[PDB]
Amino acid sequence: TTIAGLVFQDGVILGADTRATNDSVVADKSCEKIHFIAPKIYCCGAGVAADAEAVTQLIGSNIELHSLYTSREPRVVSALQMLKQHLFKYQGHIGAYLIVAGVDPTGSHLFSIHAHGSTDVGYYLSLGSGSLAAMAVLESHWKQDLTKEEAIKLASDAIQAGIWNDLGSGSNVDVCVMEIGKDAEYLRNYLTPNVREEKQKSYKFPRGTTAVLKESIVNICDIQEE
Amino acid sequence: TSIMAVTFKDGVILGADSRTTTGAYIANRVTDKLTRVHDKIWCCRSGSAADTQAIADIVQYHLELYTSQYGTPSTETAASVFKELCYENKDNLTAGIIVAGYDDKNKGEVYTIPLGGSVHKLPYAIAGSGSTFIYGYCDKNFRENMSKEETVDFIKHSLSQAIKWDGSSGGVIRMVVLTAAGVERLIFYPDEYEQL
Amino acid sequence: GSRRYDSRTTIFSPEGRLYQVEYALESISHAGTAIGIMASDGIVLAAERKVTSTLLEQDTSTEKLYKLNDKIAVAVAGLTADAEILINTARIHAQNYLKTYNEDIPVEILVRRLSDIKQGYTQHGGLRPFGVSFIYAGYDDRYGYQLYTSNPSGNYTGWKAISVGANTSAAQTLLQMDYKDDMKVDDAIELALKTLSKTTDSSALTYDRLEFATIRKGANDGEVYQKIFKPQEIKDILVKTGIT
Amino acid sequence: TGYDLSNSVFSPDGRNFQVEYAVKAVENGTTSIGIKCNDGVVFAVEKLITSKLLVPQKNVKIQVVDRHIGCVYSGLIPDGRHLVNRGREEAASFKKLYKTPIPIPAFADRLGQYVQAHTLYNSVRPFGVSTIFGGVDKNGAHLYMLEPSGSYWGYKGAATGKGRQSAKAELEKLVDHHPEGLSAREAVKQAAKIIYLAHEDNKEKDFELEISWCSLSETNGLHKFVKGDLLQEAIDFAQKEIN
Amino acid sequence: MTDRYSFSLTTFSPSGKLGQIDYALTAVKQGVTSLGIKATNGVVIATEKKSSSPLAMSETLSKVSLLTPDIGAVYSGMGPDYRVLVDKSRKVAHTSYKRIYGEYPPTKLLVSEVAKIMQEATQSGGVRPFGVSLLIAGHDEFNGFSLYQVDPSGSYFPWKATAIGKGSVAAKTFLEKRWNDELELEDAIHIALLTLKESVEGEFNGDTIELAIIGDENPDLLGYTGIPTDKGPRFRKLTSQEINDRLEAL
Amino acid sequence: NNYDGDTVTFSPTGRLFQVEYALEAIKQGSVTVGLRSNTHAVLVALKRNADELSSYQKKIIKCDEHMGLSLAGLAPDARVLSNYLRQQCNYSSLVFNRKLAVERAGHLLCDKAQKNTQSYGGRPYGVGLLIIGYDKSGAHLLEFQPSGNVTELYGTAIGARSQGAKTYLERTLDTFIKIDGNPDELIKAGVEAISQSLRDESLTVDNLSIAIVGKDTPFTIYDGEAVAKYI
Amino acid sequence: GYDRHITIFSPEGRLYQVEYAFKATNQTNINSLAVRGKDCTVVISQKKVPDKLLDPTTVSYIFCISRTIGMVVNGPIPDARNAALRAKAEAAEFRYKYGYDMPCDVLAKRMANLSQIYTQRAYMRPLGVILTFVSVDEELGPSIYKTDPAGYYVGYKATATGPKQQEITTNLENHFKKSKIDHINEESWEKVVEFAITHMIDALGTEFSKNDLEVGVATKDKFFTLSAENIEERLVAIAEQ
Amino acid sequence: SDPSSINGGIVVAMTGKDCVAIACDLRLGSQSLGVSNKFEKIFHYGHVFLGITGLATDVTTLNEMFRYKTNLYKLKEERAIEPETFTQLVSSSLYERRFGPYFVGPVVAGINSKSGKPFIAGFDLIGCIDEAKDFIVSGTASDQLFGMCESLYEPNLEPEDLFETISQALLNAADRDALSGWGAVVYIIKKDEVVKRYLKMRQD
Ligand SMILES: *[C@@H](CS(C)(=O)=O)[C@H](Cc1ccc(CN)cc1)NC(=O)CNC(=O)[C@H](CC(C)C)NC(=O)[C@H](Cc1ccccc1)N=[N+]=[N-]
Ligand SMILES: [Cl-]
Ligand SMILES: [Mg+2]
Ligand SMILES: [Mg+2]
Ligand SMILES: [Mg+2]
Ligand SMILES: [Mg+2]
CA distance G117 to G97: 23
Contact A24/H at CB under 8 A: no
Phi, psi of E92 (to 5 degrees): -65, -30
The 3-state DSSP class for residue B132 equals: helix
> Which of E101, E103, E142, E230 to mutate to probe the H interface, most H CBs <10 Å?
E101
CA distance D101 to E61: 46
Torsion sign across C-alpha atoms C75, C76, C81, C87: negative
Phi, psi of D143 (to 5 degrees): -125, 130
A101 closest CA partner among A2, A9, A15, A191: A15
Task: Count Cβ atoms within 10 A of the Cβ of residue D16 and give its class: 0-12 exposed, 13-18 middle, 19 or more buried.
Answer: buried
Residues facing residue C44 across a β-bridge? C37, C214
Q: Of the residues A48, A171, A174, which should be mutated to test ligand 1's pocket, given the most ligand atoms within 8 Å of the CB? A: A48
For residues D84 and D107, is the Cβ–Cβ distance under 8 A?
no
For residues A40 and E224, is the Cβ–Cβ distance under 8 A?
yes
Q: If residue B80 lies in a helix (H) or strand (E), which one and from where to where?
A: helix B75-88
Question: Partners for G (CB, 8 Å, 3+ pairs)?
Answer: A, B, C, D, E
H56 closest CA partner among H11, H88, H96, H110: H11
Torsion sign across C-alpha atoms D84, D89, D90, D94: positive
Nearest to E15 among C1, C26, C28 (CB): C26
E188 closest CA partner among E239, E147, E142: E147
Task: Tell how far the Cα of H30 is from the centroid of ligand 1, in angstroms.
Answer: 28
For residues D144 and D154, is the Cβ–Cβ distance under 8 A?
yes
Q: At what angle do helices F183-195 and F162-176 cross, to 10 degrees?
A: 150
For residues G71 and G214, is the Cβ–Cβ distance under 8 A?
no
Q: If residue F172 lies in a helix (H) or strand (E), which one and from where to where?
A: helix F162-176
Q: Beta strand pairing status for H193-199 and A212-218?
A: antiparallel
Catalogue the E-assigned strands of chain D.
32-36, 40-48, 63-65, 69-75, 129-137, 140-146, 152-154, 157-160, 207-215, 223-225
Please compute Rg for chain G using Cα positions: 18
For residues F59 and F49, is the Cβ–Cβ distance under 8 A?
no
For residues D19 and G21, is the Cβ–Cβ distance under 8 A?
no
Contact D123/E at CB under 8 A: yes
Residues facing residue A35 across a β-bridge? A43
User: Do B and C make contact, counting contact as 3+ CB pairs within 8 angstroms?
Assistant: no
Work out the angle at residue G162's Cα, subtended by the Cα atoms of residues G159 and G163, and round it to the nearest 5 degrees. 130
Work out the angle at residue D132's Cα, subtended by the Cα atoms of residues D126 and D136, and round it to the nearest 5 degrees. 135
Task: Tell how far the Cα of D113 is from the centroid of ligand 3, in angstroms.
Answer: 55
For residues G192 and G40, is the Cβ–Cβ distance under 8 A?
yes
| DSSP for E228-241, written as a single string | TT----SEEEPPHH
Alpha-carbon dihedral F49, F50, F55, F57, rounded to 10 degrees: -60
Nearest to A210 among H44, H194, H199 (CB): H199
> Which of A120, A121, A127, A129 to mutate to probe the B interface, most B CBs <10 Å?
A120
For residues B69 and D106, is the Cβ–Cβ distance under 8 A?
yes
For residues H19 and H189, is the Cβ–Cβ distance under 8 A?
yes
Work out the angle at residue E86's Cα, subtended by the Cα atoms of residues G111 and H71, and round it to the nearest 5 degrees. 135
- CATH number (3.40.50.1820, 3.90.550.10, 3.10.20.600, 3.60.20.10) of H1-204 reads 3.60.20.10
CA distance A93 to A87: 8
- Give the atom of ligand 1 at the shortest distance from the alpha carbon of H130: 27
For residues E178 and E37, is the Cβ–Cβ distance under 8 A?
no
DSSP state of F51: S
CA distance H11 to E249: 64
- CATH number (3.40.1350.10, 3.30.1330.90, 3.60.20.10, 1.20.1050.10) of E1-250 reads 3.60.20.10
For residues G14 and G150, is the Cβ–Cβ distance under 8 A?
no
Q: Do E6 and C54 touch (CB under 8 A)?
A: no
DSSP state of A225: B
G43 closest CA partner among G152, G153, G168, G148: G168
Ligand 1 binding residues, C-beta < 6 A: A 1, 20-22, 27, 31, 33, 45-49, 52-53, 128-129, 168; H 124-126, 128, 130
Residues facing residue H188 across a β-bridge? H21, H195
Work out the angle at residue A120's Cα, subtended by the Cα atoms of residues A115 and A126, and round it to the nearest 5 degrees. 75
Nearest CA in chain D to B87: D97
CA distance B2 to B195: 18
CA distance G9 to F168: 63
Q: At what angle do helices D104-117 and B49-70 cross, to 10 degrees?
A: 80
CA distance B131 to B119: 18
Q: Do E26 and G150 touch (CB under 8 A)?
A: no
Q: Do C99 and H64 touch (CB under 8 A)?
A: yes
Resolution value in angstroms? 3.1
DSSP state of E10: S
CA distance B117 to B94: 10
Alpha-carbon dihedral C81, C83, C89, C91, rounded to 10 degrees: -110
D72 closest CA partner among D196, D229, D213: D213
User: Do B and F make contact, counting contact as 3+ CB pairs within 8 angstroms?
Assistant: no
Q: At what angle do helices D104-117 and D77-98 cross, to 10 degrees?
A: 130
Contact B58/G at CB under 8 A: yes
Q: Beta strand pairing status for A3-8 and B108-113?
A: unpaired
Ligand nearest to the CA of G94: 2
> F53-62: long-range contacts at Cβ-Cβ below 8 A with a sequence spacing of 24 or more?
F55/F206, F56/F206, F56/F207, F56/F209, F57/F30, F58/F209, F58/F223, F59/F30, F59/F32, F59/F209, F60/F209, F60/F211, F60/F221, F62/F211, F62/F219, F62/F221
Task: Tell how far the Cα of H174 is from the centroid of ligand 6, in angstroms.
Answer: 11
The CATH number that applies at residue D72 is 3.60.20.10
Find the distance separating the first CA and the last CA of chain G, reported in whole Å.
58
| DSSP for F53-82, written as a single string | SSPBPP-EEEEETTEEEEEEE-HHHHHHHH
Please compute Rg for chain E using Cα positions: 18
Q: Amino acid identity, residue C109?
A: I
E91 closest CA partner among E61, E62, E120, E117: E117
Find the distance separating the first CA and the last CA of chain E, reported in whole Å.
58
For residues C76 and C54, is the Cβ–Cβ distance under 8 A?
no
CA distance G144 to F230: 83
Task: Tell how far the Cα of G120 is from the centroid of ligand 4, in angstroms.
Answer: 6
Work out the angle at residue C169's Cα, subtended by the Cα atoms of residues C163 and C171, and round it to the nearest 5 degrees. 50
Residue F145's domain spans which residues?
A: 1-231
* Angstroms from E11 CA to nearest CA on chain C: 6
- Whole-number Cα distances in Å, D57 to D61, D161, D209: 10, 21, 9
Count CB neighbours of C30 within 10 A: 15
HSE-CB of H6 using CA atoms within 13 angstroms? 11
- Whole-number Cα distances in Å, B33 to B138, D208, F145: 20, 63, 63
For residues A172 and A158, is the Cβ–Cβ distance under 8 A?
no
Longest dimension (CA), chain E: 63
Spell out the alpha helix ranges (H) of A121-147.
131-141
Q: Beta strand pairing status for D32-36 and A20-22?
A: unpaired
For residues H58 and H68, is the Cβ–Cβ distance under 8 A?
no
| DSSP for E34-65, written as a single string | EEEEE-SS-EEEEEE---S-SSB-TTTS-SSE
CA distance E16 to C22: 9
Contacts of F63 (CB under 8 A, 6+ apart): F69, F82, F85, F86, F89, F105, F131, F219
Q: If residue B174 lies in a helix (H) or strand (E), which one and from where to where?
A: strand B173-179
- Whole-number Cα distances in Å, D191 to D46, D58, H28: 11, 20, 94
Count CB neighbours of D110 within 10 A: 19
Phi, psi of F212 (to 5 degrees): -145, 145
Nearest residue (by CA) to ligand 1, atom 39, is A48
HSE-CB of C201 using CA atoms within 13 angstroms? 14
CA distance C226 to C42: 10
Domains and CATH numbers, chain G: 1-241 (3.60.20.10)
Ligand nearest to the CA of G121: 4
CA distance D119 to C1: 13
CA distance D115 to G78: 9
Q: Do C98 and H68 touch (CB under 8 A)?
A: yes
HSE-CB of H137 using CA atoms within 13 angstroms? 23
Count CB neighbours of F183 within 10 A: 17
The CATH number that applies at residue C148 is 3.60.20.10
For residues C41 and C186, is the Cβ–Cβ distance under 8 A?
no
CA distance D80 to D59: 14
Residue D129's domain spans which residues?
A: 1-243
Q: Amino acid identity, residue G210?
A: K
Tally the domains of chain C. 1
Q: Do G79 and D116 touch (CB under 8 A)?
A: yes
Q: Amino acid identity, residue E230?
A: D
CA distance A176 to D125: 62
Torsion sign across C-alpha atoms F106, F108, F113, F119: positive
* Angstroms from H107 CA to nearest CA on chain C: 21
DSSP state of B90: G
| DSSP for chain G, written as a single string | -GGGTSSS--TTS--HHHHHHHHHHGGG---EEEEE-SS-EEEEEE-----SSB-GGG--SEEE-SSS-EEEEES-HHHHHHHHHHHHHHHHHHHHHHSSPPPHHHHHHHHHHHHHHHHHBSSSPPPS-EEEEEEEETTTEEEEEEE-TTS-EEEESEEEESTTHHHHHHHHHHHHHHH-SSS---SSHHHHHHHHHHHHHHHHT----TTSEEEEEEETTEEEEPPHHHHHHHHHHHHT-
Give the per-residue SS3 of chain H. Answer: CCHHHCCCCEEEEEEECCEEEEEEECCEEECCEEEECCCCCEEEECCEEEEEEECHHHHHHHHHHHHHHHHHHHHHHCCCCCHHHHHHHHHHHHHCCCCCCCCEEEEEEEECCCCCCEEEEEECCCCCEECCCCEEEEECCHHHHHHHHHHHCCCCCCHHHHHHHHHHHHHHHHCCCCCCCCCEEEEEEECCEEEEEEECCCCC
Contacts of H71 in chain C (CB under 8 A): 69, 95, 98
For residues G228 and G235, is the Cβ–Cβ distance under 8 A?
no
Nearest CA in chain A to H170: A210
Task: Tell how far the Cα of G146 is from the centroid of ligand 2, in angstroms.
Answer: 16
Q: Is F200 left (phi over 0), alpha (psi -120 to 50) or beta?
A: left
Count CB neighbours of F195 within 10 A: 17
Q: Which residues of B are catalytically annotated?
A: 1
CA distance E124 to D132: 44
User: So where are chain H's domains?
Assistant: 1-204
Contact E124/C at CB under 8 A: yes
CA A215 to chain centre: 44
For residues A20 and A27, is the Cβ–Cβ distance under 8 A?
yes
CA distance C241 to F230: 107
| DSSP for C17-84, written as a single string | -BHHHHHHHHHHHTSPPEEEEEETTEEEEEEE-S---TTB--TT--SSEEESSSSEEEEEEE-HHHHH
- Whole-number Cα distances in Å, F35 to A186, F127, F132, F169: 92, 19, 8, 8
CA distance B154 to B164: 15
For residues B68 and B38, is the Cβ–Cβ distance under 8 A?
no
- Give the atom of ligand 1 at the shortest distance from the alpha carbon of A33: 15
For residues F33 and F43, is the Cβ–Cβ distance under 8 A?
yes
Contacts of A67 (CB under 8 A, 6+ apart): A38, A73, A74
H101 closest CA partner among A48, A86, A24, A44: A48
Residue C229's domain spans which residues?
A: 1-244
| DSSP for C178-220, written as a single string | H--TT--HHHHHHHHHHHHHHH-SSSS--GGGEEEEEEES-BT
Count CB neighbours of E194 within 10 A: 13
- Interface contacts A/C by beta carbons within 8 Å: 16
For residues B158 and B130, is the Cβ–Cβ distance under 8 A?
no
Contacts of C153 (CB under 8 A, 6+ apart): C18, C21, C25, C118, C119, C122, C129
A188 closest CA partner among A173, A205, A203, A166: A173
For residues B171 and B158, is the Cβ–Cβ distance under 8 A?
no
Q: If residue A113 lies in a helix (H) or strand (E), which one and from where to where?
A: strand A107-113
Q: Do G2 and C2 touch (CB under 8 A)?
A: no
CA distance E49 to C172: 52
CA distance C12 to C29: 21
Task: Tell how far the Cα of A126 is from the centroid of ligand 3, in angstroms.
Answer: 22
Domains and CATH numbers, chain B: 1-196 (3.60.20.10)
For residues C24 and C36, is the Cβ–Cβ distance under 8 A?
no
Nearest CA in chain G to C4: G2
What per-residue string of b and e applies to A37-63 under the rule 16 or more CB within 10 Å gives b?
bbbbbbbbbbbbbbbbbbbbbebbbbb
Nearest residue (by CA) to ligand 1, atom 3, is A1
Q: Amino acid identity, residue F151?
A: T
Contacts of B140 (CB under 8 A, 6+ apart): none
Q: Do D123 and C1 touch (CB under 8 A)?
A: yes
Nearest residue (by CA) to ligand 1, atom 6, is A1
